[PDB]
Amino acid sequence: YTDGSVLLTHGGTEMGQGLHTKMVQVASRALKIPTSKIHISETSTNTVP
Amino acid sequence: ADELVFFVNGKKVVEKNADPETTLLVYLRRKLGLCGTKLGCGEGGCGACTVMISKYDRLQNKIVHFSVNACLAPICSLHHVAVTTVEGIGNTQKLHPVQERIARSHGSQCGFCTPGIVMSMYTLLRNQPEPTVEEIENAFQGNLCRCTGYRPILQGFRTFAKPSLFNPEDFKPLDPTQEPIFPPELLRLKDTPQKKLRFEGERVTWIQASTMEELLDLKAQHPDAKLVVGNTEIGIEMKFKNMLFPLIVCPAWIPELNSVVHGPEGISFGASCPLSLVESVLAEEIAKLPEQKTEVFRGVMEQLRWFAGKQVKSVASIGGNIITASPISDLNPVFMASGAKLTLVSRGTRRTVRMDHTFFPGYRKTLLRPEEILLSIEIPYSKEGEFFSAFKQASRREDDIAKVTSGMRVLFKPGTIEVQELSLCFGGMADRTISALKTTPKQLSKSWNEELLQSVCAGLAEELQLAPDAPGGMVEFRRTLTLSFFFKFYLTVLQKLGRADLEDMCGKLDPTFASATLLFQKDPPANVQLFQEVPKDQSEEDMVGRPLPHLAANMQASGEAVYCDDIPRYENELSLRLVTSTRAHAKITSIDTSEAKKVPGFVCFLTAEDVPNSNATGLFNDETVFAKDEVTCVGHIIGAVVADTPEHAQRAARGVKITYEDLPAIITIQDAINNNSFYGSEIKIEKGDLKKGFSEADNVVSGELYIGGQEHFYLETNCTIAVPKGEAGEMELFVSTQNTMKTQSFVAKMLGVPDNRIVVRVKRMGGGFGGKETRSTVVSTALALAAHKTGRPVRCMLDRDEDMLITGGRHPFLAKYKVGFMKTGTVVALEVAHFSNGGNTEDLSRSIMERALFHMDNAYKIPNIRGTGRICKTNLPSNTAFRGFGGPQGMLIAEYWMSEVAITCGLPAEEVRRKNMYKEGDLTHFNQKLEGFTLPRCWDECIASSQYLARKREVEKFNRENCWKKRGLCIIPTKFGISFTLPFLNQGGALVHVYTDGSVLLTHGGTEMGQGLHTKMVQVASRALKIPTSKIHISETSTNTVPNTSPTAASASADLNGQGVYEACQTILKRLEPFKKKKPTGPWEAWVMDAYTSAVSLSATGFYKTPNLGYSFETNSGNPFHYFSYGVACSEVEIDCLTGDHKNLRTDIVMDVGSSLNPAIDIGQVEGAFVQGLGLFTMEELHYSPEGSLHTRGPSTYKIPAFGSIPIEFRVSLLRDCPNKRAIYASKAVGEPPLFLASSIFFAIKDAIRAARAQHGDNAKQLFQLDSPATPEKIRNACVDQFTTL
Amino acid sequence: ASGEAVYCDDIPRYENELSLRLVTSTRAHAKITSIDTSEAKKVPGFVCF
Amino acid sequence: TSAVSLSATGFYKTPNLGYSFETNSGNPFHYFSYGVACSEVEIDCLTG
């Protein structure tokens, strides 16, 4: 988004295994920005099929 | 008893605790969840809430069916009736023929008005299975549509009466045996005697009286008890005037109040008789009785003709209109003029009075004692030698408040033309219905002649004097109308005396005077829609260029389409009500919420203090979320009340007491000029040498023009639901907005959370028209704050009055022009200074001025030209985008001075326009080259198809042969630049998924507001992917599927999103290529599954930016626009020189839409845009107090085009063979360009007025003033004559 | 840790929301010879089986 | 403000997988996880 914040989603679902945590860590390294600027809200078939 | 029992769509409703304040609309939507019936105004004007009522009528002994406004019907009035809503007649699984035909005929665009219109048509068919064309049109007098331009609704429904856009051969027939049963229980209950009912609510007690004894007993014991019959007055008093009547009695069941008795002197109607019954009784009598007996009946009928619509007349009582005693009552002047007999009763007393001046002794008061009720009114037969006329002139013919309304009666001494009796009665000339008691006695025994004419006119002008500050305004026009009405009466009586063989006594009427006395006559509609067939070789599955109906049309006709407020409420959901400033400019000195806190269900009052992060909002960060320290307009949002229900939120918002200290206010454009109060610097475009140009010119003309603003009147008002997620500041908002990105950004900034936390979702809007491009956020931010604070979902849908006040409209414009031209009509120099009224924030105002300046040339090449613009900063609600975005204002000015060029030169206007028109390859004043210039083609086709030259002949003939009616005819071209004036906004995105069943889910940044954008994008995607449209779906628009989207605005959304959709589809095709090569003829589903099991991605983004844009004001170089739209309209009008009313006789439009993506939608957009322009230039007018408070807050006072407003002959052609290679599949944008073409009606009116001034003017000013809108007031006042001079 | 994390049943109900209960076999392998819902239909709030 | 898209999909498939039971060939797995655990217990012989 234009404020520089990142909304990420992927096909994986969070069930306690810290999958979203790991994906934010991955995205933060890939993009070279702090994890605080990246958010994952949910998993949905209408964002990733 | 006290249980309320009725039926809804055949299902029994038992309501054990009915509240008298609960309307049928609220009950249906909120208690029963049936959201097909809509809220559009809450005041009887729009018909969006139209439902059908069926009951066994005990008086007529039969099942009856009639339509009502659900928004005004108390449920307590509905004991033992059967309600039918849109859901009750059919659905998408089995559509009613009414529903099928409106959908397939392209009669539903945004869809918000569709259920109400469906219900009006359905009710007509239940009463008359084979109606006439006239009866069909009459069904919709109380229904408004802002999108369609009405044409397709009437044309589709014409199939019920008595390539192509649709095929009536394919419509299934009506089988009336398949309609819902009248609930058998109700037929069983009709044998049981009616009993008195008592309903007790939160604040009101309702007594449903079963007998006259019960009613009179109750009014004796409690004279305070408020009678309610139709509730079409009391409903408005309660909702809008904040009046509370704690005790109500409904006498509607009482036989004596519903009786019709024929006597020797007339017909007596019980006071509770609906106006619809009066109409049908009097119609029967007029048809069967001698003409000489029915003069009064026909006068009543003439008034009822323009009295509301079917829904109001179904329930509105004759007694209700009498006792309300509004000075602008349409029936009271007629009842007074005819001396109608009124019977009044109380317990023990009975008296009879003749309505005269004594009956109305003061404002909204009658002769009645507090314990008395009106029992009946006898409407009299007329006598031999007795003649009657009734008149009404409002702002719009249909469903409007009279400016002047009148009943006039004359009785002649037998065998003579000598006056025995004369009565001239008026509404809208005092604080009550008045008789001209000083004028009329002077005429007794006089002969009906020119001397009586002048004597009465002199008397009326003296007796019915208006102070310049009289309530109602328009004092010159009103005075002129009283005289003009009598003149019409005088000439009509001359004719009636002639027919009584007294023509040698009173003389013949001059044949050129005859048309002055004609009662309004409609003349049957004729429509032609022309477009281009797709190539013969084109696949039948390729829908691009085909007239595919709006994808949601069936669901919209069935009321299954979901708009924001139709979404079910969460169990824990709260309601919000905005609290707004009642002062234009003042300090807030204190806020007292003491009373608000006492309202049951009150949660909190939010102010600037409650904002977590930033109170600075708006496009240019110059707006407050909530007012701090000062208010800067009437409507300025100070805070927001949160409560459990919308009723309690409203009540609590009234308990928020604000104290103000006034500060100097700047209201008008002149105020701002005087105070140097502007948004930024002057904007300027200049080319050539102005000093040289003016010196070389044979002629120079200077003038000023004012152009009034415009309220959007999208049928669905602003609405937001905000759902807080309780984690990480996450929030989801469902919003009626064209701008998801700004909604998201503004909410996030206010809350102090990143954009990634906030999701904005838009399924569809019930219209936007620019009004929801930015101004929707003032509701969204307030609701988001409430949700954040409470942790509960919160919802707000604005009432029409709130929405019209707060959200602003089109920019009013003031122009000062100077034009230099040759005696040939060639324009050589032009200087125009534009001023706009921007209101209290910047918003889009400067871009709007840029567009106005970009279009000050309209279609004309002008070598030496200078345009400036200045945006006024004022203490009014902020004005914003409206379809056209400054273009229509700039172009009206161009056409205004152009009309004056042609008159000054003494040359035919069309010739002057044509010779000044650009040619292919010319540069505009802003130095953009005009390529693919199709305007001359549109012009030549329109000139020929409209038969402009032969009709000019006929117009001139008409004007020589008629003194008091005049015709006018004008042909107007247009050029409209396509692209956002802000270059980077010309971008769009899409996201596409293919699921493993082969079905495709598509989304893009554009929002659906009735313009058929999703339909177009599905058509695009289907051609791109080479699969049928049936396999592709668009569900919604959301910020978490496509980010950073431009607003759905600038007509550009199909262009931008279409390219994005195309690119996303090409990416998918690229991936499927190897699978297509392996299995060349194998189905789409095989390729998809093969790709999936080969682990190939079936998801893609698409993106487009418009190339090579960017104009510089500094250097006057660079292209602001990707391409231009072109069109031409020829319109003819006929004006009534005595009243200011006019008929739109014929309009022919030729429009360049390139190779249309969908000609059905495109013709619909042409028609819709044209009719909004028709409103802007001739009908729609906003009125403010001197202190800057908007008076015009609902359809009662703000008059948008009606079914009856549209051109009688309405022809639209899409230009053939004009592909536009630079936009998606050779199409052109269509949304805004046709709107200005309605100026053809404005200039046709100006033509007609010129003719009228030549007829009766005494050396009248040649270049007379006609500001926009050209309303009946402005038209009549400009027709200078012996009446305007008196 | 704070109970603010939202799991499926923590989502607020809509005002018009209904509840479902599965009806399951009490037999390992059998023909269904009949189903009688007469007693179910007497329960307040029953919508359908 | 230069109108560059700020949205992107991403996708991955694990390469070179596919075992056949008929030929006993091809790799079903991308790699293997490995680990070792040492545990000590004390049972009550009289109770379990």
Ligand SMILES: Cc1cc2nc3c(=O)[nH]c(=O)nc-3n(C[C@H](O)[C@H](O)[C@H](O)COP(=O)(O)OP(=O)(O)OC[C@H]3O[C@@H](n4cnc5c(N)ncnc54)[C@H](O)[C@@H]3O)c2cc1C
């Ligand atoms: C959309 C719309 C369009 C309209 N257009 C017009 C128009 O063109 N011309 C015009 O003149 N009006 C117009 N009106 C006003 C209104 O419809 C009429 O005045 C109508 O006749 C009121 O009747 P009702 O039964 O609905 O009155 P109610 O609201 O039920 O009552 C009105 C008043 O009359 C009193 N009353 C009713 N019956 C009796 C009785 N028998 N004895 C003593 N008092 C009684 C009530 O106490 C109350 O004060 C319009 C209103 C709407 C909403």
Ligand SMILES: NC(=O)C1=CN([C@@H]2O[C@H](COP(=O)(O)OP(=O)(O)OC[C@H]3O[C@@H](n4cnc5c(N)ncnc54)[C@H](O)[C@@H]3O)[C@@H](O)[C@H]2O)C=CC1
């Ligand atoms: N809702 C609708 O669409 C329509 C409603 N009706 C009527 O319109 C009414 C509107 O009510 P209000 O706004 O309260 O208007 P109102 O009942 O106060 O009447 C206003 C009009 O009365 C006249 N008037 C009042 N005082 C005057 C004075 N001192 N001198 C000269 N003229 C004076 C003026 O013509 C003014 O426009 C409704 O109650 C209803 O009966 C009629 C047509 C349409």
Ligand SMILES: O=c1[nH]c(=O)c2[nH]c(=O)[nH]c2[nH]1
């Ligand atoms: O150039 C435009 N910019 C806009 O933001 C806008 N909005 C609109 O309705 N028309 C336009 N035109």
Ligand code: FES
């Ligand atoms: S909502 Fe009832 S008429 Fe507009």
Ligand code: FES
């Ligand atoms: S379609 Fe009639 S209001 Fe939108």
Ligand SMILES: [Ca+2]
């Ligand atoms: Ca503004």
